[PDB]
Design a protein around this ligand. Sequence first.
Ligand SMILES: Nc1ncnc2c1ncn2[C@@H]1O[C@H](COP(=O)(O)OP(=O)(O)O)[C@@H](O)[C@H]1O
Ligand SMILES: Nc1ncnc2c1ncn2[C@@H]1O[C@H](COP(=O)(O)OP(=O)(O)O)[C@@H](O)[C@H]1O
Ligand SMILES: Nc1ncnc2c1ncn2[C@@H]1O[C@H](COP(=O)(O)OP(=O)(O)O)[C@@H](O)[C@H]1O
Ligand code: ALF
Ligand code: ALF
Ligand SMILES: [Mg+2]
Ligand SMILES: [Mg+2]
Ligand SMILES: [Mg+2]
Ligand SMILES: [Mg+2]
Ligand SMILES: [Mg+2]
Length: 1937
Amino acid sequence: VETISTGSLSLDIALGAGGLPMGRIVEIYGPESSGKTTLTLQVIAAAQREGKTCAFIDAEHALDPIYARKLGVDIDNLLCSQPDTGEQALEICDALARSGAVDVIVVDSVAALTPKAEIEGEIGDSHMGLAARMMSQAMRKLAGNLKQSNTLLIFINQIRMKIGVMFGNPETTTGGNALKFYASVRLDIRRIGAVKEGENVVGSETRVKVVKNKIAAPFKQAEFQILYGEGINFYGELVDLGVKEKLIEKAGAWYSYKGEKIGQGKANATAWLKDNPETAKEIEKKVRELLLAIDENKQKALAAALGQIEKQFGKGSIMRLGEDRSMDVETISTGSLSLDIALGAGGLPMGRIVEIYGPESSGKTTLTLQVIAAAQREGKTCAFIDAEHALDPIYARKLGVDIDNLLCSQPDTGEQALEICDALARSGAVDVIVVDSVAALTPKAEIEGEIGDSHMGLAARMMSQAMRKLAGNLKQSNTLLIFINQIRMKIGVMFGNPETTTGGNALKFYASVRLDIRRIGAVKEGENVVGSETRVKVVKNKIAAPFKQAEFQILYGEGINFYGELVDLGVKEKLIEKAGAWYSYKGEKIGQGKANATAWLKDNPETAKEIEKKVRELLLSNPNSAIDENKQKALAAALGQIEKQFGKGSIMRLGEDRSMDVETISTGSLSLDIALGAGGLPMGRIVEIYGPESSGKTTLTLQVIAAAQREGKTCAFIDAEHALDPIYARKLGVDIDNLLCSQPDTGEQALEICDALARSGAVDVIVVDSVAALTPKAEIEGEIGDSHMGLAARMMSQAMRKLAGNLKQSNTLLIFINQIRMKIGVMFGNPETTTGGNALKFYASVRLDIRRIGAVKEGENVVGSETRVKVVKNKIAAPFKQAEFQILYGEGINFYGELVDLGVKEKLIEKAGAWYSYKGEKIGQGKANATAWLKDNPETAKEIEKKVRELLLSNPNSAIDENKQKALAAALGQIEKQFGKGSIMRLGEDRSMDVETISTGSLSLDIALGAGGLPMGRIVEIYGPESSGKTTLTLQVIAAAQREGKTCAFIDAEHALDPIYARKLGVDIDNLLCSQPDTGEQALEICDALARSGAVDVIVVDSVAALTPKAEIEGEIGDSHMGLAARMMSQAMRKLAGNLKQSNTLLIFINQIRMKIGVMFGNPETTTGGNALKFYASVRLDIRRIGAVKEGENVVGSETRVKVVKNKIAAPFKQAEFQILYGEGINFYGELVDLGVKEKLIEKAGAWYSYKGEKIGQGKANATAWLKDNPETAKEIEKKVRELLLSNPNSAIDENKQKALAAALGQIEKQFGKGSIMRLGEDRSMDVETISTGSLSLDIALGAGGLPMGRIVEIYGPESSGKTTLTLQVIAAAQREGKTCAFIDAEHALDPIYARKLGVDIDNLLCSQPDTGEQALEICDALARSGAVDVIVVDSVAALTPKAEIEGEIGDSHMGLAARMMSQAMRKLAGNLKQSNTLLIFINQIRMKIGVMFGNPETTTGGNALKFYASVRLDIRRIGAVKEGENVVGSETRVKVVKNKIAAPFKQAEFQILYGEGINFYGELVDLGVKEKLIEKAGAWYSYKGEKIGQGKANATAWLKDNPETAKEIEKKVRELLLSNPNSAIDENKQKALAAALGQIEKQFGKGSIMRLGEDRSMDVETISTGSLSLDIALGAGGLPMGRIVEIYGPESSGKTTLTLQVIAAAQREGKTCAFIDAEHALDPIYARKLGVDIDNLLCSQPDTGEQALEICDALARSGAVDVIVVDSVAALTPKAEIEMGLAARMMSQAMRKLAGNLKQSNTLLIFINQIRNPETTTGGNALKFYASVRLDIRRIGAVKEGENVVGSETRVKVVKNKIAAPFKQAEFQILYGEGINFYGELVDLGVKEKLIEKAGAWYSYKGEKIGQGKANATAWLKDNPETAKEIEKKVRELLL
DNA sequence: TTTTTTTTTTTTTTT
Ligand SMILES: Nc1ncnc2c1ncn2[C@@H]1O[C@H](COP(=O)(O)OP(=O)(O)O)[C@@H](O)[C@H]1O
Ligand SMILES: Nc1ncnc2c1ncn2[C@@H]1O[C@H](COP(=O)(O)OP(=O)(O)O)[C@@H](O)[C@H]1O
Ligand SMILES: Nc1ncnc2c1ncn2[C@@H]1O[C@H](COP(=O)(O)OP(=O)(O)O)[C@@H](O)[C@H]1O
Ligand code: ALF
Ligand code: ALF
Ligand SMILES: [Mg+2]
Ligand SMILES: [Mg+2]
Ligand SMILES: [Mg+2]
Ligand SMILES: [Mg+2]
Ligand SMILES: [Mg+2]
C-alpha cells in the first residue's frame, strides 16, 4: 500500500491510508465546478513535488495550462493528451501503464471517453452503453498493467440522474458500473459553500466523501477550501487540525504555537504557516502521526511509449503541456466589457462549450448575437442554430451581425441540430456556433411521437451523447460553442433554488463557461422603455475566477451599450474624470452626463480602444495569450454535406432565408400593431396573450382572426375554454363558416391538434383559448384533488418544443390565450403569473398584457371596455410599447376609432374644437362622427392607416392554395379519425356550440344578460353579500328549468338550503338532486360525474367558499393551507368546462365576498376559490340587496340589483333591478309590468294599468296579480319585450338520461357514502328543526319558531345588550328538552351562578375557556363531529384571538388574521354541523368602520366569513329600562332578524330581560295574546276566555307562571297564528360519544380545557373590595370580579385614579399584589400612601407607548403573579406610530382580545381608568366597553365642607355595565382628600337607611346610645370603635347583598 | 444507458 498525497490533508486523513494508492484505480466524481479536475491536479502537483511523472488525459478538452501552473503543477513536465476517441484515451492509459514510466495518470471525464463508433456514427442513434462495455474492457486490462507498474490511475467522472428511481439517491456515474468495482478509492467531491473576501467570491468551500475504500476505512469525510488561482488551502486545514489536536492554542481569536502568538484569526494562522514552512512540516508530521540506472530506465521506456502513442494515433496525440499550441486559452469578446471582465479571461474560450441561461426576454439570444457581431468584426465565421425558430434577421443586423455572412439553421430535430454542430465543428470552418435553446432540441422520437408521449429525459441522453462527441471536435477546431438554454423549476424542492436548465446535467459539466443573464430593470427615455437593464453572472468558469458579475444595458435596436460600460469602468478605475456631471479624459471634457460620455466614445473609436485595453490590463486576472481558402473549401463541403443529409434549406445564409422573414398579421388594433413595432403578430412564431377575466383576450384573438380571414387566411380556434360565442365571433367580423373550431377534451388532444394543423401548413393562424384549460389526460381521468403537480407544465414544455419547428416551416402563427394566477407568499415585484409554466414565456415571440382599464359609456349604458395592452415580450421589435383603445361589445375593437386619434396626434387629421377635418374637408363633428365616416370611406381609411404606420413603426413590412385545402382536409380527417366525429369542425356548423340560454327567473336579468339567460354548457358565477339572494336566484333558475323539464342538481356545500323554501320558490323538491358533500373535492367530483353523465342540465354549487379541501378538513383549524382551495378550483375548472359543454350542462357557482386587506386601488371586493373561477365563468353576477319592499310595517321583500360583471355571451355590465318577495321569490311578472310600462306595451293613466285598452289593475300590485292570473297574456307581453330590448335574442331520448342519471347517482353514492346525494324531498337531515330562543316574540319573528339545528347563528349587539343572556336562554330551553349544550366563554366572563338563575343546568352544561381562538374552534369542530352536543355557543368571536396574535405582541399587525381563521372555521364547521344537527351560535361584538359616509358604520368581528354561513343573524339591543319605580330591574330589549335563511327576515321581537331571571317569556306571551285577541284587555284587567287572570301586565305575568297548562295552550295557538314556517339505546349513544369527545378535547388541549360549568373553579365570581361599601353594594356581588376587566370612567378630578388606588389598598390589605400603569404620568406616590396603598409593594409603570403599556399588562397577567392591574387612562395609551385616526382603538380591540384569556386563567383583575369625550363617550373605542365585566361612572356631585375649607369630593358612582350582578344600582359617598373614601361615612348612611342607626334630627344613635351629633361625628366615633363598625358593617352586608 | 417539468391566494382592520 504505497500512497500519494491528494493535496488535501483532511482528505489524506479521511482516506485513512494517507492518500491515493499506487497501482490502483481511483474514481473522483462530483458536480460541475465541484473541483474534480482541480483535486486531480493537486495530487499531480504534490506528486511532481516528489519527482514523479504525471500524465493527463483531458478527454474533457477543458484543462487550463496556465491554471494548472497556479496549482503547483509542472506544466513543462506534465504529459497531456486530448484524445479524439475514448478507446484512444484508454489505449494511451494502457501504454503509459505498461511503460511503468508514468507514476500517475489521470483521466478528465470518463463521461468524455466517447467510443469510436459513437463519434463516426450520428448524433441520435442506439450505441447504448457502448461506453460501458468499453470501460469494462479497459478496467479489465488496466488494473494488471497498473499494479505491476505501480501506476496510480485517477478517473474523473460526472454525475447523472437515472430517470424515475425512488430508492435512495438517483445519483450515478458515467461509463457503467465497471469503474465502480475496479476503483480502490471512490471520491464524492462537492462544493458546499463560498469562501468570501467580503464582497469577492474567492473560494469553493469543498467537501469530499470517501465512498469507496479498499485501502482503509471508507466514508470518512474531508472538508476544506479551494481558493481559485491557488488551489487547496493546505495550511488552512493544517491550522484546524492543529487546533482539534491541541497542537495549536486558541484563546478566542488568537492562535498560538508553543506559547508564541502566530496570528489573530484563522486567516492570519494561514499566512504565518505559509511564511514558516519549517514549522508547518513539524506540525504536519505530528498531526499525521496522531490521525493516520533507476530513472534512465524510465525515460528510455517513456520516450518509447511516447513515440509508440504518437505512431499509432498521430502527430500531437500526446505531448508536454507547456508546449501545446492547440491548448492555449483563446478568448472572444462577449460584446459586453464588464462581462469580459467578469469572465476574468476577457471573453469566451475558443474550442470550449458555453452555456448561457436566463429568463424569457433576459437577453440570451441578444448576447449571443453580440459575440457573433464582434467575432465577425474580427473576421470569424459564425453559425446559428435557431432551434427556437425565433431569430429576427433584421434585428440581428441592428446588433452589428453580418446577416449575409452568418450561417443559420432552423433544424427540425435536435439530433439534426447537433449533427450540424458536429459537422460544423469537424470542418473547423466555423469559429463559433451558437444554439438558440437546447430546450428546443426536440428529439426525433419526440416529434414523431405524440404530445403526451412520455419521452422522459430522452432529451438529456441526447445532450450527454452530443457533449461527449462535440468537445473533442470543438477543441481540435478551436470552435467555440454557445448554448442558449431556458429556466425551468424542479417541483417540490425545499433546498436552495429550484432554478434549472434543460437538456439535463450533461451540458453543465462540459461547459467551460455558464452564464446567468437576467433583466434587472428598465432603461427609460422618461416615458418610453428603451432598454433592458441587464445583469450576467458567471456561474461556471474553467477559464478564470467564477461568480464575478457584469451589469450593463441592452438598448433595443442597438444591443449592448459597450461604450456605456467602458465609461463606468473608466470612471471606477480613475481613467475618466467625473466632476459632478461632467466626464473628462486627460483633462479634455468629453461629455456632460453618461449619455454624452457614451456618444463621444462612439464618435472616437481610437480613444475607446486605448481606454478599453488599459481597463482590460487593470481588471483581468487571466489575460489573452492559402489560409482562408482552406476554410471556404471545407465550408462549402460541409454546407453541401449538411444539405445532402437533411434536405434543401436545412442550412443557409441568414440574408437569403425566405422562411425566416418577419411576416406580420394585423391584431385588429392599430395602436397595438404600432406598439408591436413590426405592425403585428409574427407568422410562424408563438404569441401569448394573457390578462384578467373579461379583459378581452379571446376578443382580441378573434379580431386578428377576422383581419386574417379578411386577407384570405385560414384560422383555427381551440376553444379549450369551452366558451366561444359563435354569433359573437360573427359580430367581430370573423368568418364563422370558414373558421376551424375545436373543443378538445384533453390538452394533449388540444396540442396534437395544433401540431397536425401546423404540420399541414394549411392553417395560417391557430389560436388556443386558455392554456389554463389544457387539462392533461391524467388529470381528467384522475380525480379532482389528485396532485398532478405541474403535469400541465411539462406538457406545455413538450408542446412548445414540438410546435415552434412545425410552426416556422408552416409560417403558421400560434396564439395562446392564458389566464392570470397569483403565486402565494411572494414579497418581491408582482405576484402575477401565467398558467402552463414558464415554457410558453420563452417560446413566445410576443407576450401581451391586455387589461380592462375603464368604461366606454353611452351616458347610462355601458357599451365598451376601455382597454390597454402591453407588449411584455418582443422578439420582433422593441418591447414594452403600449396600446390603448376601445372594445365595443357586439362590434369589437374600434379600429377606426384608433385610426382617428392616431391621425389627430400625427397631424394627419385636423381638429378645430369638435370638428374633425381631412385635407380641409370636414369629416365629422365629434370623434363618434369621425368614426362612422372612416367606416363609410375605407379608401380614405387605408390611405391614412398606411401613412400612420410609416410614421410610427420601427420595423415595416417587406397550384398554391389547392396544396393547402388538400393537406387541410387530410389533417381534418386525420384529427377526426384519431379523436372522434366532432373533434374539429367549422364554427358556423357547430350544433353543440350554440348559445342555448336558460331563464334566470328574473326578466330584467335575462334582459341585462343580453342573451336572455344563462348559457348552457358554460360556468356561471354569482357572487354577492350575505342575504343578497345568491342561493335564491339560483333556485329560481332551477324552478324555471324544471318548469321546462330539465333536471337540476344542487350542491349545498353551504349546508343551508331550506327544502320547504325551495318549494315556495317553485322548485320541484322531489325531482331536484341535492348534495351536502363533506369535502370540496367530493363536491366537485360530483359536479364532474353529473356533467359527464349529461343527465343533469344544470348543476348549482352553494358557496365555493365552502368547498373545503380534504387536507383542510382533516388538518386543524389554524393549519395554513394557503390557497389550497384555489389550486383545487383551478384543477376543477380545468376538468369541468369540457365535460360541461359536451353535456350542455350549465354550472352555476355561488360565491361569497371577501376583502383583500391593505389595498388602496379601486375596490377590495373579491371572490373565494381564487381567480380560477373568474376566467372560466361565461357569466359573472353581482347580486345585491339595495333596499326594502314594505307592506307598510312588515318587511316582505329584498329590493335587489344584479350586475353582469362578466359576459362571454352578450354585452356585459347591463344591470337588472327587481324584487325578491320572501316565501315567493323573484317577482317575475313585477318586472314584466315595469318593462311593459317603459316600452309603451302597458298603459299607465295615473294608478290604473291598461293593456290594449282593457283595464288590468289599479296599482302595480294589481298589475302583478292579473298577469299571474293570465299567463297567456304574460307570454305574449314577455316575448314582445324580449324582441325590443335584447341585443342578443334566443336561438328513446329521456330514458338515455335516467339510465345515465341513476348510474351516476349510484356512482356518487358508491364513492362518497349513503346519503352523499339524493332528492331534496326525501332528505331527513335537511329538515328545518328549530329550538326555542327563550323569547317567544323572537321565535315568532324568526318565522320558523326558533333557531335552526345544524346551522350557524350569529347574534351581535351592544355591550350589555343581552347577547350572552339570550344565548343562555336558548340553552336553558334546550336543556329543558334534554339536549346537551356547550359554551365557549372565549369572552372569559360567564357567571356560573347567573347562568343558573337563567334556568341553565350548570352541572350538565359544557364550558370552555379556550386560550386561542383556533383552540376555541377546534373544540367546536370536535363537538360537532361527535354529534354529541346539540348546541354550541361561542361567547364573542371578537375574543377568538389567533395563536400568532397571542404569542405575538400587542401592536403586532395581524391584519385580519382573525378573519382568515373565521373563514376557514366556517368552511369546516357547517358540514360537521348539519350531519350532527348541531346548532352553533356565535355571539359577536359591534365595531365601527371608520371613515364611511354611507348607511351605517356598524359591523361585526371576525370578517364577513360568519355573515354568510350564518342561517340566522340577530341584532339584539337594549332600548329602555324596566323599572320597579326606583330600582332598575330590567333591560327593555329589541332583537332584529337581520339574516334569515329559515323564514322571512327583518321581523323584530321586543321583550324584557329581568336581571336574575332572564327573558320574561310569559311577559311576551301576554302581549302576544293581547295583540292576537287571545287575551282580553278591558283597561288594566287582563282576561282569558272571560275569566279574569290579573290586573296589570305584572299580574298577567305571574298567573301564566302559576298556570303552565294554560300557558302552553296559549303559546301554541299564538305560534300557529304568527309563524310562516312551523315546526316539522337513543341517549346512551350520545353520552358514549360525548365522553369520547370530552376526553378527546381534554387529551388535545389539556386538563381543564372543557368541563361542566357547575364544577369550574377558575370560573368562580371572586370579588375584591372597591374601598367603597355602597359601591360594593351597588355592584351587587360585593366588589370587582377577579379575572375580568373593569372600566372606570368619569370627569377630570372625579376620583377615577383615587378609587382605583382604594381597591389596591384593600387588596394589599388582603395580601394581594397590585400593579399600576400610570400611563397618565400623574400618580402621586406620597398620596397613594395616604390612601392606604403599600407604596413599597405596589408595582408601577410609566410606559412610553400604549403597546408597551398593554404588553406589560399581558406579561403581568400571564405570570398570574399580579392579582390586580390598573391602567391610569386608556386615553394615554398612545400607539407607537402616534409618537412616531382610531389607531388607538384597533390597539385596544387587539389588547382586549389577548388579555381576557390571560386574565381569567390568572384570576387577575384588570381595571382601566378612562376619560370622557348623551354625547358622553369613552376613549379607546367600543373595544373596552364589551370586554369589561363592570363599567363605572364616577362623578363629583358636590363638596364636603369643614365650613370654610373644602376637604371632600361628594362622589357618586353608577354601575353602567354589570356582568356580575344587577347593573345601574348607584353608590354615593365621600372622598376626603389626603384620606380617601370615607368608608365609615358610607357605613353611617347605610346604617341610617337600613334602620340600624337612629337619626332624631342631627343626633345619630346606636341601640339607644348617642354616637354623635352630625354625620361628621357619626364618622369619627365609628373610627374610634372598630368593634361596633364591623358589627354594623356585616349586618348591612347581610341585608343588601 | 440518462430528468422530467410549477403549483396556485390568503383574508379586515377598528371612533
Ligand atoms: N427584434 C427585436 N427588436 C427590438 N428588440 C428586441 C428584438 N428581439 C428582442 N428584443 C429585446 O431584447 C431583449 C433581449 O432579447 P432576447 O435576447 O431575444 O431574449 P432571450 O434571452 O429570451 O433570447 C428583450 O428585452 C427584447 O424585448
Ligand atoms: N351576573 C349578572 N347578574 C345580573 N345581571 C346581569 C349579569 N350579567 C349580565 N347581566 C345583565 O343582563 C343584561 C345582558 O347581559 P349580557 O347578555 O351579558 O350582555 P352581552 O350582550 O354583552 O353579553 C345586561 O343588562 C346586564 O347588566
Ligand atoms: N397629588 C394630590 N394631592 C392631593 N389631592 C389630590 C392629588 N391628586 C388628586 N387629588 C385629589 O383627589 C381627587 C381625585 O383625584 P383623581 O382620582 O386623580 O381624579 P381622576 O378621577 O381625574 O383621576 C380630586 O379631588 C383631587 O383634587
Ligand atoms: F377568456 Al376569459 F375570463 F379567460 F373571458
Ligand atoms: F384627574 Al383625571 F382623568 F382628570 F385622572
Ligand atoms: Mg475540470
Ligand atoms: Mg431569443
Ligand atoms: Mg374568452
Ligand atoms: Mg343561500
Ligand atoms: Mg356576555
